[PDB]
Subunit: 1016 residues, 2 copies
Amino acid sequence: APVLSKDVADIESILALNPRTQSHAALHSTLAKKLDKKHWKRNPDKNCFHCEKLENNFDDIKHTTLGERGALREAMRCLKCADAPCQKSCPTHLDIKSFITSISNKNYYGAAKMIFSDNPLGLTCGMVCPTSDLCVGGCNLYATEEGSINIGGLQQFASEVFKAMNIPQIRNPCLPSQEKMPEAYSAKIALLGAGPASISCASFLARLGYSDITIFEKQEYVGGLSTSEIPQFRLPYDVVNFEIELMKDLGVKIICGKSLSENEITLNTLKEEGYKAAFIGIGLPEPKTDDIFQGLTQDQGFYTSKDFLPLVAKSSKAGMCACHSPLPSIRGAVIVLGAGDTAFDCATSALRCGARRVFLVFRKGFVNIRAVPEEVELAKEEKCEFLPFLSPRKVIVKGGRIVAVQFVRTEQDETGKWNEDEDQIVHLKADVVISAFGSVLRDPKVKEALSPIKFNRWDLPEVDPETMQTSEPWVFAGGDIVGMANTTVESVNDGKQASWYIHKYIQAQYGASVSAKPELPLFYTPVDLVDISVEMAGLKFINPFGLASAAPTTSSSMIRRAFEAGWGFALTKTFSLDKDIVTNVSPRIVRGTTSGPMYGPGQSSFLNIELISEKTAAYWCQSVTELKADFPDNIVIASIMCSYNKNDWMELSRKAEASGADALELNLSSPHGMGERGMGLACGQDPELVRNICRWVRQAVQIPFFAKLTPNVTDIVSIARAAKEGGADGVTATNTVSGLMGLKADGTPWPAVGAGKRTTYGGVSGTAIRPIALRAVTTIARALPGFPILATGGIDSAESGLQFLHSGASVLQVCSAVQNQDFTVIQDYCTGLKALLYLKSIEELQGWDGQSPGTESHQKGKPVPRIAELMGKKLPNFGPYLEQRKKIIAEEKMRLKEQNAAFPPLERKPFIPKKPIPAIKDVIGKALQYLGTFGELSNIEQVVAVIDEEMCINCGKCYMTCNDSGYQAIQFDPETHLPTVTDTCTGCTLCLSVCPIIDCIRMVSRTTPYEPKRGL
Amino acid sequence: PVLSKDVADIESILALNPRTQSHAALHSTLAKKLDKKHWKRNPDKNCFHCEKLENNFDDIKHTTLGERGALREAMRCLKCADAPCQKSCPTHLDIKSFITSISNKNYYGAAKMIFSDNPLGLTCGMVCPTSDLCVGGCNLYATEEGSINIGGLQQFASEVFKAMNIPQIRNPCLPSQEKMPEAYSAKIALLGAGPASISCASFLARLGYSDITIFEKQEYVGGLSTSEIPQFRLPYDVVNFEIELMKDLGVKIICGKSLSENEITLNTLKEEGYKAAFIGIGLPEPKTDDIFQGLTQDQGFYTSKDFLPLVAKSSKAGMCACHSPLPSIRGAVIVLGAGDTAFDCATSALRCGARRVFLVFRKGFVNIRAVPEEVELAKEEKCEFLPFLSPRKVIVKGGRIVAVQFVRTEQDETGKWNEDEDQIVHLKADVVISAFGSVLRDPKVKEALSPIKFNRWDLPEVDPETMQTSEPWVFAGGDIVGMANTTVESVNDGKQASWYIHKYIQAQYGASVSAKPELPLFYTPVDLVDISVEMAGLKFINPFGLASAAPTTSSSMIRRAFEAGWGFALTKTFSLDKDIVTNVSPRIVRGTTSGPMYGPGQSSFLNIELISEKTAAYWCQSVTELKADFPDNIVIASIMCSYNKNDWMELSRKAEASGADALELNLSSPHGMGERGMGLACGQDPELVRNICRWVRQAVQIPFFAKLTPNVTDIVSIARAAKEGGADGVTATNTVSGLMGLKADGTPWPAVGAGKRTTYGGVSGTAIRPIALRAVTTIARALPGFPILATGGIDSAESGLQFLHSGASVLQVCSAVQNQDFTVIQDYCTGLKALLYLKSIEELQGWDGQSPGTESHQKGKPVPRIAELMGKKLPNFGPYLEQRKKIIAEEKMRLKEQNAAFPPLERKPFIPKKPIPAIKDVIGKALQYLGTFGELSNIEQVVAVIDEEMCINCGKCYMTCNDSGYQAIQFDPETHLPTVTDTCTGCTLCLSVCPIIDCIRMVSRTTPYEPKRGLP
Ligand code: SF4
Ligand code: SF4
C-alpha cells in the first residue's frame, strides 16, 4: 500500500487554487499589483478615454434589466410596505407591494396581472420609467445602505414572462354578454393618435364594455413615440407590438393613414359621422426649432430629433415599416443640442450610426439638466462629451457639408437672468448637427381641426386636469398634447383618467347614470377562470387556502377580514372549556435564526411559546355562528383542546358543533402522563391516546373532525392511523416542531421572560420546517391513501402549496406566511394557482417549470451571444478576455450590417389549452408515485455535473465545494477562473447546490464507465 | 354584540392596512405630481440649489455600513476561491476570509485579517478608491445587483475592532526581547509620518526590531490622511487609532525634525549610527503656475497644499494645539484640476461657505483622472463642471481676485492638445484654488538625500521590488517614489520595503534570511486565549471538528482539514465488507428552507447519501497514518453494522486497533420487523441502542459516542439508553427526516434514474439548529455531565458558543464547510477567542458578543442628537426631511461659534478586569434559564416600543399586528410612523419582522395588564 491519507500528485495540482489558511502577510510589489489588476477588471476603467465600437449595436443597454435569479433576490429584498410610498409616487398607482410580492412567490402571471390592471403598458413603462424621479424616488429602502428597489426591472421581468406565456387578454368577465349590453356601450368613439395616451384610454374603455372604439393614427405605424423615437436598445419594438395586441384582444380598432387635420378628420366630421366622444392624444408632433438652422439639410448633416430618431428606428425596429431602411451614415463628429431625454437618445443613436464622437451641447449647466441621471448614465458611459453654458449662433457649411458650429457663452447673474456673452465664442468643429430641443404643436391645420376647443397660453388644448375634458364636453385630451405629462407612464395615466369621465359623459348622454366612485375594471386573462375549488371530507372549499389555527386567527374579527380578502377557510385559535383557560407570557414569538442575520421580510421561521386561545369558548362559538352566518361558503373549523377527559372532549366538541362549525380540529398538543415510554408527554405522541380521543369525539358529534398531528413523533403514520381507527375523517399535518431558536452570547435565551430571563421549548413554524411537514404529509398519504390531509408547514406561495397538493394534501393552512406579510397574500396564492394549472394545458410551454421559463444562457440577466467564435474559445467576462468578446461582437454586428436582410418579426398568436385545465383533484397525490424505498433507486443510472461557462461568474464555489466536501473533480483554470468538471465526478450534485447562477451547472447522464471510489 | 367585527376605533386603526383590490385606481396626473413631493426620499433632479453645508463635516460616504447593512452584504458575498477582488487589492488583503468572518458576526477575526496585511485598514476601507481596485475586479459585478461593497465591510469590521479598544501586541512567536539577536536592535530611521512609513515601521516591528524611529517634519502625524483628506471622508480619530496601534509595538515618533540640509541628512544619519533608512516624505510641495505668482490667500488664491490644511486644521480636533478658523470663503470659487485633490477642494469649499463652486479642467469629462466615487460627491453637492478650459490670466482689482480668463482647449488629429487663443471665457470668481498635484522641489530636502540617484521625474529611483534606492541602506516608498496614487499603495510600498530592509540589516550583521518573504501577522491579546477543552478523557486543541459527512469523504480531506486548524474530525461512516454500499446520483441537493436564495449561505441541504463507499481497510489504514502525523488532533472513527452482536464487535475492534481516539456508533441502521410503530432504524428504539452500546463497550477500551437521531419522540430516552449500554457520550444530532421539494410538475429533487424517483433524505444545515439545540439542552438537563458532541447548523463561533452554553463540549460541523471550505476553522477559532476575551472586559458588558449596543442610526450613521429634531415627529422623507436638514444646518452654524475641541480622549486600551473564561467555564451555563412553562412569569409582561429615529416607515409592524396580532399599532398616514398603543400584549411579532435591528424593543409593562378574553 501507499499513503492513503495524502493526495496523489495530480490531485495536489487539482487543488492548486483551493483556499488554505495563512501564516504570514503576502509580499506583492505595488508595481506588480498594477499590472495584475488589469487581468481581472470587470467594470469600466477610469483611464479609458475610449468608447468601444457600437455601430449597428442595438442590444439592450439598460442597467435595470433582470433575469429570474436577479428578480427573485430583489423581490425578496423588498419590504412589501403597507401604504407603500412607491405606489404613491407611481402615476398609474400600481400596487407595487402586491406584484413584487407575487414575484418573490414565483407567481409572475399574478404580478403581471397586477401590473397591467393599473397600466396597460406595464412592460414598456417597466423598461423606460424614470424610476428615480417617480416610484423608486419614494422607496423606504432608500433609507438603507443597500438602497432602493429596482421596481421597474422587476415590473419588466414579470411582464416579460407574461409575454412569453402568450396568454390573451379577455373581455372583462364581470360584464354581461355583448347582446344584453345597454345601447350606450355601442356609442361610436374616436381616439386620435396611437401613442401611450390613446392606447391606455381605448383599453380602459373596452374594459368598461364599449364595443366600437377606434384609434385614428396619422402614420403607417402605431405606438407613438415608443415606436418612432425611443431607441431599440432601450425599448424593443416587439414590446410595443405585444401591448398593442393586448389592446386589440379587446376589440379596439386601429385605422392608420387618417389624420386630425383640416381636409381630413376634424371634430366636426366626427360629430357629423355620429361619434359621441373623442379623445385627443396626438402628442407633440413638431420639433422645437431654432432660426439659426434655417436652410440646412440632411445632405449637409443637419437633423432635428424628429428627423434623425425615426430614421434610426425605421431601420433598427423590424416590423415598423415595409422598408428595410438603411442606417443613416453619421461618420465623424456630432453635435446634439438639448438637455431633455430626447438629446441623450440622439447621442447614443448617433454612436450606433457610426459616429466618432458626440458632444451634448446645452445652453445651461450640469445642475440644470432635464433628463434623469438614468438617461444621462448611458450617454456618459458611451463616452459622449458634455458642453455646458453654450448657445449656438452660426453653422459653418463648407463643401456642401457642415464643418463647424460656433457658440457663445451663456451666463447667470445675481438676478437669475441668462444672457449671452458675444465676446466669448466657441468654434466647435463638427460634421453632424442634431437639434433636440424638444417638441411642440404648431401645425395650424391640426389646431384648426380642433375648433372650437380652447387653447391656453402655450397654444395647447386646455383640459380639466381631473377629468381631461376640454372646453367641449364630448372631447377629451391627454398625454404630451396636454403639456402636463413628460413620461410614458403619465401619458398612460392621462388616458386612464379620461376613460372613466368619458364613460361618465357617454352614459349621461344616453340617459344613464354612473356611480359617484370611479371604478375602472382590472386586467383579465382566461387564467382568471380556472376553477381552484376542491372538496374534502364532504366539505367544499372555494379555494384550497385557509388560515391555520394560530396568531392570524387570534380574534374572529381578523377571520372576517381574511374571508373578505378571499381566504377559502379558517381555523379558530384553539380554545377550551373555562376550567382550562390560560394566560400567555411575553415575549412569546421570536424571529427565526434558521437562515442567518436576515431581518425584515421573508423570515424563514418563527419560534413561539404561545398557548391556546386566551379567549373563551363562548366567544369562539358565538363568533363561529356570526362568521358562518355572513360567510356560508367559507369553511370555518373550530380548533379545540381538552385534557385526557372523555366528558371534556365530548362536551366541547358538541358545543363547537352546535355553534355551526363546518368541522372540528382536535389539537393533540395537550399533555397526559409523564412522557417517554417511547410515547412522549403530549397526547398526539401516543397512538392509544389519540385513538381514544377520536373515538370520544366521534360518539359526540356528527360533523367531520380532523386530528392535528405533531411532527415530534418517531412514527407519525402510527398516530394518523390511530386517529383513522378512532373515527376521525382526516388529519392536519403538522403542528410546529419543538425547538430552541437560540441564545445570546451571554447564555440567555430568546424569548426571555421576566427578570429571570427564563424560557421554555417553543414551536418552530415557517419554511424551515417545510421538509418536515412535507415528509409527514408524504408518508401519511402513502401509508393511508385517500385519508384527507390538511397540510400545514411553511406554505407561502402557490408553488409551495401545489407541492403539498402533489404530495397528498387537499387543503393548505397558512400561518407564518401571513405573519411575514398580511392577509392579502391570498390573492397571490389564488392567481398563482390558477396560473400553474392553466400552464399544464399549454403544450408550447412544456419546457417550463411552472411559471419559470427554461433558463437560457445569460450574463446580468441578458442573453449571451450565440456567435460561433464567441462560444468555445475560453473567454470569461473580465480582463483582456472581455475586450476580445467586445471586439468579436462588434465585428459581427458589422457583417450583420453589410447584409441588411432579415426583417421577419414573428406574428403574435396566443397559445391554446390542448387539454382540459386540471382541477385541484387532478393533481392531488400525483407526485407520490416517485417516492420509494432507497432500493427502488437506480444506481446504474449515475449522473455527472456539467458547467455552462457562458453563464458562469467565475467564483469557484463549485471548485471549493468539490474539494473540501467532495471528490476533487473540478479543475479551476488559474487565468480564466473557469471551472471544468472532470471524469472523476461522482454526481453528488453538491456543486450545483452551491452555484449562484441558476441552471449554470447541470446534472446529465454519465457516458463514461463508473467505478465507485472504494479506497482499498 | 357582534364579536367577529371590529369596533369603530379599531376600524380606524386599520385604515392603512392592505386590502385586496377589485378595481383599478383613479388618480389624475396633476394630483400625482403634487403627491410625489411628500414621499420623496432622494434628491430632486429639479432642485438646482445646493443645500447649506457650512461647517458640516458629517460623513458623506455612500459606502458606510452599520451592522445590519454590513451583515447582509457580507452574506451576499460569494466568498470566492482565488478571489479576484484580492488580486486587485494592492496589499493583497484576504477579502474572502475577513468577509466570511463578518458574515459569521466575528468582527475581530475580520479586523485581525485586515490589519494583518494593511496596518491602515480602517483608513483604507474608508478611502479605498475601490472601483479602480478591489471592487473593480469583483465577480458579483456580473450580476444585476452588482459588486460587493468591500470598503464598507472593511470599514465596519475595523470600526467595531476600534471600539473594542484592544491593543496590538508584539509577535508572540518572537523570542523575548533579551534573547533577540543583536541585529534587531539596529537603529532604524524613517522619514515622514505618512502611511508609507507607518506601514513599514509596523511591519519592521512585527519582525522583531526594537529601535524604530519615525521623523516627522510637522507637529502632527498621518501625512495627507491628517493634513488634507477631509474630515467628512476620513475622520482624525481613525488616523489616531492606527497610530496608537503602531506605537503599541514600541515604534518611536519624533515631530519637528525634518529631512533637510540644515537638519536630517543621510550623512547625519550615517554619523549618528543609523543602519538603515526609509524615505516616506511624500510630495510636500504644490504644482504651481506662473499665472499665479504673487497671489496670496488674502487675494483669494490658494493651492490645494494651502487650502486643505487650513480646513483640516480647523475641522480635525486634536490634529493641532492651535485652534484654527474655517477659511472665510465667500462667493464664487474656481477649483482648477480634476484629480482626487481637486474634488476635495470643491467639497471642502462648500463647507467654508462657498456660494458657487466651479470645477475647471484643461481637458474633457472623458479625461477626468479622479474616480467616479470622488466625482459623485461634488456632483451631488451641485458643483459646476467646466471642461476644455486652460487658465490664461487672473484678474486682480483692488487687492482681490475678481475673475479668471480661460482659453478653450481642444484635441486635434494627433490627439495633441491645442489652445485656441481666440476663444475666451471671462469667469467671475472671488477665490481660486489650484489643485494641479504635488511635487518635490525643495533643494534643501533633495540635498539631504545626496547621493541617491534621482530620475527624470525628479524622484528617488528604487528597485520596484525591493524599494531600495541607489544607496543600499536607503529605501523609499509611497508618493515620493511616484508609483503610488492611493493610501493602500503607499501602505504596500512600506510593507514591501520592510522585508528587504530586514534583509539588508540582517545581512549587515552577518545573518541571512528566508528566500521566501514571510511577514508576520497582526496580533492582539485575543490570539492568546486558550480555547482547548477536555472531554471523556481526550484533549481537543479546539472544540471544532468535522462531522461524519461529505467534508470527510476521504482521509486526504481530513489531513488538509487538520493542516488548516480543525480540532478533531470524524471519519465518514464505514462498515464491514459484507455491508458495502453503492450510492446513487443525484444525492445532495440544496435546501428550500429560505426560498430562492442561491450561492453562499444555503440554510440547509438534503441528502440521500449512504455511508462511505470506501472500505474499513482504507479507513483503518487512514486512521493510523492520520494519527501518526497528527497526534494532537482527535480522530474519531464512525462505524456502522446491522443489528448483530459479532459484527458490531468485529468492526469496532478493527477501528480501535488502527489507532482511533474514539468511536462514533452510527445507529441509522435498519433492523428486522418494525413491530410497534417505533421506527425502522436502530437509533429509534432504546432497547437496540442499549444493546449496540453494550456490544461495542464489549469490543473496545477507548471511548465511544452514540450519534443520536432527532427523528424520535424523546431523544433523551435513546440518549439514556446509550448511557445504559456502554457509551462515554452522545453526538446530538444526525439529520432530520424530510423532503426538500418538488418541481411544479410533481417530480422530486433529488431525482434518481430515468424514473425520476427519490426517497426521504436528511435535512442538515442551519434550518435544523433549533432541533439540534433543543436536543442538546434536553440531554444536558436530564443527564448532567454526560459528554455531548454537538451537530446541527454550527456555522460560526457564535452558533457554536450556543451549543457550548447548552451543554456540549465539542462542536461537529458539516454544512458550513459544504457552503465554503475547510478554512472556516480559522474564522471559528478567532471568533471563539474574541467571544471569550470580551467576557472579561467590563467596558463592553453592554455588547451582545461582538455586536455593540445599537444606537439611533439611518443608513448606519449616527442620528444627530439635537434638541430641536426630537420629540417633533420628523421622518426622513418629503417635507419632513427638509425641516430636518434645515435644523441640522442651523446647528452646524450654531456649532461654529460654540467652539470646543480641547476635550479629546487618551485612547487608553481596555484591560481584562476578570479572568478570561475557558471552554470548561461556559458549558451548561444556559441551562439555568431553561425550564417548564410553569416556571415562566405571566406577571412580568412586556410591551413593544419603537425608536422613530431608526424606523424606515415600512409598516410591517403595523400589518403583522393587524393581521397576526392585536391591532395595537397606529400607522400615521402622513409620516408613516408607527406608535404602539396600550392594547399591546407583548407577543413580540412586530419586533420579529422589523427590518431594522433594535428599532423595536420589548420593555416592561407599566400600565395594568388584562388578558384579552373576548367574553367574560
Ligand atoms: S483596496 Fe483598500 S478597501 Fe479595497 S480590499 Fe484593498 S485595502 Fe480593502
Ligand atoms: S417594521 Fe420597523 S422599520 Fe418598519 S415601520 Fe415598523 S418599526 Fe419602522
